[PDB]
Amino acid sequence: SLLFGKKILVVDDNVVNRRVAAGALKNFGADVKCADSGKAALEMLQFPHKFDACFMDIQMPEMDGFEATRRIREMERTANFHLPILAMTADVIHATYEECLKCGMDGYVSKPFEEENLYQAVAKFF
Amino acid sequence: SLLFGKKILVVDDNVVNRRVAAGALKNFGADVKCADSGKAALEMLQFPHKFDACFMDIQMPEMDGFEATRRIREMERTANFHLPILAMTADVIHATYEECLKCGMDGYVSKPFEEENLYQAVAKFF
Ligand SMILES: [Ca+2]
Ligand SMILES: [Ca+2]
Protein backbone atom coordinates (compact mmCIF):
# COMPACT_ATOMS: atom_id res chain seq x y z
CA SER A 1 0.00 0.00 0.00
CA LEU A 2 2.40 2.63 1.26
CA LEU A 3 5.18 1.35 -0.99
CA PHE A 4 2.77 1.01 -3.94
CA GLY A 5 4.20 2.67 -7.02
CA LYS A 6 7.81 2.77 -5.87
CA LYS A 7 10.79 1.27 -7.69
CA ILE A 8 12.93 -1.10 -5.63
CA LEU A 9 16.21 -2.70 -6.78
CA VAL A 10 16.80 -6.23 -5.47
CA VAL A 11 20.44 -7.40 -5.45
CA ASP A 12 21.22 -11.06 -4.81
CA ASP A 13 23.44 -13.76 -6.32
CA ASN A 14 20.76 -16.42 -5.73
CA VAL A 15 17.90 -16.67 -8.22
CA VAL A 16 15.46 -18.16 -5.72
CA ASN A 17 16.24 -15.38 -3.24
CA ARG A 18 15.62 -12.71 -5.88
CA ARG A 19 12.33 -14.48 -6.92
CA VAL A 20 10.98 -14.52 -3.35
CA ALA A 21 11.81 -10.90 -2.44
CA ALA A 22 10.72 -9.54 -5.81
CA GLY A 23 7.41 -11.38 -5.68
CA ALA A 24 6.78 -10.04 -2.17
CA LEU A 25 7.46 -6.45 -3.23
CA LYS A 26 5.52 -7.01 -6.46
CA ASN A 27 2.56 -7.97 -4.29
CA PHE A 28 2.77 -4.69 -2.37
CA GLY A 29 2.53 -2.66 -5.58
CA ALA A 30 6.22 -1.97 -5.88
CA ASP A 31 7.67 -2.49 -9.31
CA VAL A 32 11.00 -4.30 -9.00
CA LYS A 33 14.26 -4.53 -10.92
CA CYS A 34 16.73 -7.24 -9.95
CA ALA A 35 20.51 -7.59 -10.21
CA ASP A 36 22.67 -10.71 -9.76
CA SER A 37 25.76 -8.94 -8.55
CA GLY A 38 27.28 -5.94 -6.86
CA LYS A 39 28.95 -4.95 -10.14
CA ALA A 40 25.54 -4.88 -11.83
CA ALA A 41 23.82 -3.01 -9.00
CA LEU A 42 26.38 -0.23 -9.43
CA GLU A 43 25.83 -0.17 -13.21
CA MET A 44 22.10 0.28 -12.60
CA LEU A 45 22.62 2.95 -9.94
CA GLN A 46 24.29 5.56 -12.08
CA PHE A 47 24.22 9.33 -12.20
CA PRO A 48 20.45 9.60 -12.90
CA HIS A 49 18.70 6.37 -11.96
CA LYS A 50 15.20 6.85 -10.33
CA PHE A 51 15.24 4.03 -7.71
CA ASP A 52 13.39 4.59 -4.42
CA ALA A 53 14.99 1.85 -2.28
CA CYS A 54 17.34 -1.10 -2.58
CA PHE A 55 17.45 -4.55 -0.91
CA MET A 56 21.08 -5.62 -0.89
CA ASP A 57 22.29 -9.11 -0.11
CA ILE A 58 25.33 -8.98 2.15
CA GLN A 59 26.92 -12.24 0.97
CA MET A 60 27.92 -12.40 -2.67
CA PRO A 61 31.05 -13.77 -4.28
CA GLU A 62 33.63 -11.32 -5.69
CA MET A 63 31.96 -8.23 -4.18
CA ASP A 64 29.71 -8.48 -1.14
CA GLY A 65 26.80 -6.21 -0.24
CA PHE A 66 28.92 -4.29 2.24
CA GLU A 67 31.40 -3.17 -0.42
CA ALA A 68 28.78 -2.48 -3.04
CA THR A 69 27.17 -0.21 -0.45
CA ARG A 70 30.39 1.63 0.38
CA ARG A 71 30.60 2.12 -3.38
CA ILE A 72 27.00 3.32 -3.77
CA ARG A 73 27.58 5.83 -0.98
CA GLU A 74 30.79 7.12 -2.57
CA MET A 75 29.05 7.16 -5.93
CA GLU A 76 26.42 9.39 -4.33
CA ARG A 77 28.91 11.74 -2.64
CA THR A 78 31.01 12.26 -5.78
CA ALA A 79 27.65 13.16 -7.37
CA ASN A 80 26.95 15.97 -5.02
CA PHE A 81 19.42 12.28 -2.18
CA HIS A 82 19.91 9.18 -0.04
CA LEU A 83 18.99 5.90 -1.65
CA PRO A 84 17.63 3.86 1.29
CA ILE A 85 19.58 0.59 1.26
CA LEU A 86 18.32 -2.32 3.35
CA ALA A 87 20.40 -5.44 3.96
CA MET A 88 19.09 -8.98 3.31
CA THR A 89 20.84 -11.16 5.94
CA ALA A 90 19.33 -14.57 5.11
CA ASP A 91 22.77 -15.90 4.14
CA VAL A 92 24.12 -15.27 7.70
CA ILE A 93 20.91 -16.43 9.34
CA HIS A 94 20.84 -19.69 7.51
CA ALA A 95 24.45 -20.34 8.45
CA THR A 96 23.96 -19.83 12.18
CA TYR A 97 20.82 -21.95 11.88
CA GLU A 98 22.71 -24.94 10.56
CA GLU A 99 25.26 -24.29 13.23
CA CYS A 100 22.46 -24.56 15.82
CA LEU A 101 20.85 -27.72 14.52
CA LYS A 102 24.25 -29.35 14.09
CA CYS A 103 24.95 -29.37 17.84
CA GLY A 104 21.48 -30.76 18.51
CA MET A 105 19.32 -27.73 19.07
CA ASP A 106 15.72 -28.14 18.04
CA GLY A 107 15.63 -24.77 16.27
CA TYR A 108 16.11 -21.05 16.75
CA VAL A 109 14.03 -18.05 17.81
CA SER A 110 13.47 -15.60 14.96
CA LYS A 111 13.22 -11.91 16.00
CA PRO A 112 14.65 -12.85 19.40
CA PHE A 113 13.06 -9.94 21.35
CA GLU A 114 9.49 -10.17 19.95
CA GLU A 115 7.04 -12.07 22.14
CA GLU A 116 4.83 -13.57 19.44
CA ASN A 117 7.97 -15.06 17.92
CA LEU A 118 9.13 -16.81 21.11
CA TYR A 119 5.65 -18.36 21.25
CA GLN A 120 5.75 -19.34 17.56
CA ALA A 121 9.05 -21.16 18.12
CA VAL A 122 7.58 -23.48 20.76
CA ALA A 123 5.21 -26.06 19.25
CA LYS A 124 6.87 -29.02 20.90
CA PHE A 125 3.61 -28.77 22.88
CA PHE A 126 0.64 -29.79 20.74
CA SER B 1 -1.84 -19.97 26.31
CA LEU B 2 -0.50 -23.19 24.86
CA LEU B 3 2.74 -22.87 26.81
CA PHE B 4 0.86 -21.84 29.97
CA GLY B 5 2.00 -23.91 32.92
CA LYS B 6 5.27 -25.10 31.43
CA LYS B 7 8.73 -24.62 32.93
CA ILE B 8 11.29 -23.00 30.63
CA LEU B 9 15.00 -22.51 31.42
CA VAL B 10 16.52 -19.31 30.01
CA VAL B 11 20.31 -19.32 29.61
CA ASP B 12 22.12 -16.07 28.84
CA ASP B 13 25.20 -14.20 30.09
CA ASN B 14 23.43 -10.84 29.72
CA VAL B 15 21.04 -9.76 32.48
CA VAL B 16 18.95 -7.55 30.20
CA ASN B 17 18.59 -10.40 27.71
CA ARG B 18 17.43 -12.78 30.44
CA ARG B 19 14.97 -10.11 31.76
CA VAL B 20 13.35 -9.60 28.34
CA ALA B 21 12.94 -13.28 27.41
CA ALA B 22 11.81 -14.29 30.89
CA GLY B 23 9.24 -11.51 31.06
CA ALA B 24 7.88 -12.54 27.65
CA LEU B 25 7.53 -16.18 28.69
CA LYS B 26 6.18 -15.11 32.08
CA ASN B 27 3.46 -13.24 30.20
CA PHE B 28 2.46 -16.40 28.32
CA GLY B 29 1.92 -18.31 31.57
CA ALA B 30 5.23 -20.11 31.51
CA ASP B 31 7.10 -20.11 34.78
CA VAL B 32 10.77 -19.41 34.12
CA LYS B 33 14.12 -20.23 35.70
CA CYS B 34 17.20 -18.39 34.46
CA ALA B 35 20.90 -19.23 34.34
CA ASP B 36 23.87 -16.93 33.63
CA SER B 37 26.12 -19.54 32.15
CA GLY B 38 26.48 -22.84 30.38
CA LYS B 39 28.08 -24.34 33.49
CA ALA B 40 24.99 -23.38 35.50
CA ALA B 41 22.51 -24.59 32.89
CA LEU B 42 24.11 -28.03 33.11
CA GLU B 43 23.95 -27.97 36.92
CA MET B 44 20.21 -27.25 36.69
CA LEU B 45 19.62 -29.90 34.03
CA GLN B 46 20.61 -32.94 36.04
CA PHE B 47 19.40 -36.50 36.22
CA PRO B 48 15.81 -35.60 37.29
CA HIS B 49 15.06 -31.97 36.48
CA LYS B 50 11.44 -31.33 35.21
CA PHE B 51 12.09 -28.62 32.55
CA ASP B 52 9.85 -28.53 29.46
CA ALA B 53 12.00 -26.38 27.14
CA CYS B 54 15.16 -24.30 27.16
CA PHE B 55 16.16 -21.04 25.44
CA MET B 56 19.93 -21.14 25.04
CA ASP B 57 22.07 -18.18 24.09
CA ILE B 58 24.69 -19.20 21.55
CA GLN B 59 27.31 -16.61 22.51
CA MET B 60 28.66 -16.82 26.04
CA PRO B 61 32.21 -16.51 27.31
CA GLU B 62 34.03 -19.66 28.50
CA MET B 63 31.35 -22.06 27.21
CA ASP B 64 28.99 -21.08 24.40
CA GLY B 65 25.46 -22.33 23.83
CA PHE B 66 26.63 -24.77 21.18
CA GLU B 67 28.89 -26.64 23.60
CA ALA B 68 26.46 -26.53 26.48
CA THR B 69 23.98 -28.15 24.09
CA ARG B 70 26.38 -30.88 22.98
CA ARG B 71 26.79 -31.48 26.71
CA ILE B 72 23.06 -31.51 27.47
CA ARG B 73 22.56 -34.04 24.67
CA GLU B 74 25.35 -36.27 25.96
CA MET B 75 24.02 -35.83 29.48
CA GLU B 76 20.68 -37.11 28.18
CA ARG B 77 22.16 -40.09 26.29
CA THR B 78 24.29 -41.28 29.21
CA ALA B 79 20.99 -41.13 31.14
CA ASN B 80 19.23 -43.54 28.91
CA PHE B 81 12.96 -37.67 26.77
CA HIS B 82 14.17 -34.84 24.54
CA LEU B 83 14.47 -31.46 26.18
CA PRO B 84 13.52 -29.06 23.36
CA ILE B 85 16.38 -26.55 23.15
CA LEU B 86 15.88 -23.36 21.15
CA ALA B 87 18.75 -21.02 20.28
CA MET B 88 18.67 -17.26 21.01
CA THR B 89 20.74 -15.69 18.19
CA ALA B 90 20.45 -11.99 19.11
CA ASP B 91 24.20 -11.80 19.71
CA VAL B 92 24.94 -12.76 16.05
CA ILE B 93 22.09 -10.65 14.71
CA HIS B 94 23.21 -7.55 16.49
CA ALA B 95 26.74 -8.03 15.19
CA THR B 96 25.76 -8.31 11.54
CA TYR B 97 23.47 -5.33 12.10
CA GLU B 98 26.30 -3.09 13.19
CA GLU B 99 28.26 -4.45 10.29
CA CYS B 100 25.44 -3.29 7.98
CA LEU B 101 25.02 0.20 9.38
CA LYS B 102 28.78 0.69 9.45
CA CYS B 103 29.07 0.55 5.66
CA GLY B 104 26.16 2.96 5.31
CA MET B 105 23.12 0.74 5.01
CA ASP B 106 19.95 2.23 6.38
CA GLY B 107 18.99 -0.97 8.20
CA TYR B 108 18.25 -4.65 7.74
CA VAL B 109 15.26 -6.85 6.93
CA SER B 110 14.25 -9.05 9.86
CA LYS B 111 12.78 -12.46 8.91
CA PRO B 112 14.09 -11.96 5.37
CA PHE B 113 11.49 -14.21 3.63
CA GLU B 114 8.32 -12.91 5.37
CA GLU B 115 6.37 -10.31 3.40
CA GLU B 116 5.01 -8.25 6.28
CA ASN B 117 8.59 -7.82 7.46
CA LEU B 118 9.91 -6.47 4.15
CA TYR B 119 7.09 -3.92 4.32
CA GLN B 120 7.85 -3.08 7.97
CA ALA B 121 11.48 -2.35 7.06
CA VAL B 122 10.54 0.35 4.54
CA ALA B 123 9.23 3.51 6.24
CA LYS B 124 11.56 5.84 4.39
CA PHE B 125 8.21 6.64 2.74
CA PHE B 126 5.92 8.49 5.14
CA1 LIG C 1 23.66 -14.45 -1.23
CA1 LIG D 1 25.13 -13.54 24.99
Author numbering:
A (entry chain A), B (entry chain A): 856 to 935, 949 to 994
Give sentences copied directly from the paper behind this entry.
This work focuses on the crystal structures of the REC domain of CRE1 from the model plant Arabidopsis thaliana and from the model legume Medicago truncatula.
The crystal structure of MtCRE1-REC was solved and refined using X-ray diffraction data extending to 2.5 Å resolution. For MtCRE1-REC, the coding sequence of the full intracellular domain (MtCRE1-IC) was cloned and expressed, followed by limited proteolysis with thermolysin. The intracellular domain was digested, leaving only the REC domain that was used for crystallization. In the MtCRE1-REC structure, the coordination sphere of the calcium ion comprises five oxygen atoms, three Oδ atoms from Asp868, Asp912, Asp959, one backbone O from Gln914, and one water molecule.
